[PDB]
Amino acid sequence: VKNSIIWFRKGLRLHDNPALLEACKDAKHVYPVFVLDPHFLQQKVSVNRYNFLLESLEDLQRSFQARGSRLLVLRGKPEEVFPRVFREWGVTQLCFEHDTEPYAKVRDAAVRRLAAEAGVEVVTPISHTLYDTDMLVARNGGAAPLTMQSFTKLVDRVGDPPAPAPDPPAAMPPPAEDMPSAAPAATGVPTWQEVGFKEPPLTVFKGGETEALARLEAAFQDPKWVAGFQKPDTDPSAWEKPATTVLSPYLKFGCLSARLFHARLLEVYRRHPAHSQPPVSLRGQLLWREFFYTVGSTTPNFHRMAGNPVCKQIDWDDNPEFLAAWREARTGFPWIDAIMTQLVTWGWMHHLARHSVACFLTRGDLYVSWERGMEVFEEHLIDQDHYLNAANWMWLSASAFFSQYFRVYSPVVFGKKYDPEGRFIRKFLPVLKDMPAKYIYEPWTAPLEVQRKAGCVVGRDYPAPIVDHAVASKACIARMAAAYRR
């Protein structure tokens, strides 16, 4: 007979899940399995992203229960758990989505060795990305592109990505009854309290396939806004209705298929001929995700500076005092501090909002290593992607891809061009909710009578700026000019 296991790691979805379709095909019993390490916290990971994962698991549970099946959340390590449940369930086929991360390449190779000793067929289709990222490197001549423009000409030379896979059947083969490793009490979806978290999640984005599909349709409600999407022109101070899709947390965990997103964009572009072109287009943003995934998978030490053949070697400063002030939203700059507050509260910021805080920490003012700022973003970002966090932090640090260090964002005037009233700052920094808009970006420039009337006195209620931008910026630019002379 056929008893199949569909292993979920990314790909927390049912639409366009080619590995799920192979598992359910001709199967007598299907075992949807998610491997959960109960000692992860005893290793880093905030409760916002982790509950986003748990909420995303509850969506598959309701989806599997609606189709006559059931999601099995197994505890332990895949290498210890899979050899047991193989012979316990009589497994003949194991399917899971292909992953190109460094840890995943070591982990899947081990499970491939374990399934071969148990006589289990391993099937790993690609759907997390748009294309076969190995086929991109082969058709390019054996090397990955290092520019978006060279990368854009490659995927256009290949053609359209594969269409999204059809929906799975409405009735799935259930797991076999009376199995010890599939007990409901041991395979239930845990809560954030039970996994060992004290504080509740404060984010506003609910995880799951249902939420990803609903947010997708809401974005395509206005095809005019979809076709004319230009990324650098979006508003980073828009928090009530963000100026972008905010689909990154769902694309990270796999709740939303990238090929589903791409084929929906083509439906709009075919009717809107003056639509935006890459890289500023909405497709182009998906191509950024496809571009960084291709280079990082073929580049050694991509999440680090040393040993990285594409990262410029820069003698970043070790200043724990600036790092503590930047990660704790106490830099004295309300524009930077409000964004770092939105990071720990929502887990998501606008792309240009991440630009201001990343530039300020590195090549802009504090000259702290981009690696240290990436660790802070790995923990709180609900859309944390290993290849994407890394390449975008080397961009903002002028270490790779980007090399125009002379462009330094002003932590005072950047947010003023979009929000002169400071509506963004007053929401996340309520200590300045009464400060007049004339001094809300520069609280140290307000007279002491205005500071008391507004209820916010610099130094007692709000910290003074840790640096003078004109002095700090002038020092960081000169150092990067001497380093880029290497």
Nearer of residues 81 and 226 to ligand FAD, judged by Cβ: 226
User: Please, are residues 378 and 385 in contact by the beta-carbon 8 Å criterion?
Assistant: no
Strand stretches in 232-314, DSSP E: none
Dihedral of CA 182/124/295/151: which sign? negative
Nearer of residues 65 and 230 to ligand FAD, judged by Cβ: 230
Nearer of residues 396 and 425 to ligand FAD, judged by Cβ: 396
The piece of 222-230, 242-250, 261-269, 406-414 that touches Cl ion (CB under 5 A) is 406-414
Task: Compute φ and ψ for 6, nearest 5 degrees.
Answer: -100, 105
Determine, following the binding rule CB under 5 A, whether residue 360 of this chain makes contact with Cl ion. no
Site for ligand FAD in 223-252 (CB under 6 A): 231, 244-248, 251-252
Residues 6 or more apart in contact with residue 43 via CB below 8 angstroms: none
Rounded Cα distance, 407 and 110, in Å: 46
Nearer of residues 260 and 359 to Cl ion, judged by Cβ: 359
Residue nearest ligand FAD (C-beta atom): 244
Beta-bridge partner residues of 123: 95
Determine, following the binding rule CB under 5 A, whether residue 414 of this chain makes contact with Cl ion. yes
Task: Compute φ and ψ for 313, nearest 5 degrees.
Answer: -85, 120
Closest separation between CB of residue 407 and Cl ion, Å? 9
245 annotated binding-site participant: yes
Site for ligand FAD in 330-359 (CB under 6 A): 350-351, 354-355, 358
114 annotated binding-site participant: no
Closest separation between CB of residue 358 and ligand FAD, Å? 4
Closest separation between CB of residue 350 and Cl ion, Å? 15
Site for ligand FAD in 395-414 (CB under 6 A): 396
The piece of 14-22, 80-88, 375-383, 412-420 that touches ligand FAD (CB under 6 A) is 375-383
Residue 200 DSSP symbol: P
Q: How many CB atoms lie within 10 A of CB 407?
A: 11
Buried b (16+ CB within 10 A) or exposed e, 249-259: bbbbbbbbbbb
Nearest to 146 by CA among 280, 273, 353, 292: 292
**End-to-end alpha carbon distance in the chain:** 64
Determine, following the binding rule CB under 5 A, whether residue 250 of this chain makes contact with Cl ion. no
Rounded Cα distance, 238 and 480, in Å: 33
What does the per-residue mask of binding to ligand FAD show for 273-302, with x meaning CB under 6 A?
------------xx-xx--x----------
User: Please, are residues 464 and 444 in contact by the beta-carbon 8 Å criterion?
Assistant: yes
Nearer of residues 299 and 356 to Cl ion, judged by Cβ: 356
Sequence ranges of the binding site: 231, 244-248, 285-292, 348, 351, 354, 383-385, 389, 392
Binding site listing for FAD: 231, 244-248, 285-292, 348, 351, 354, 383-385, 389, 392
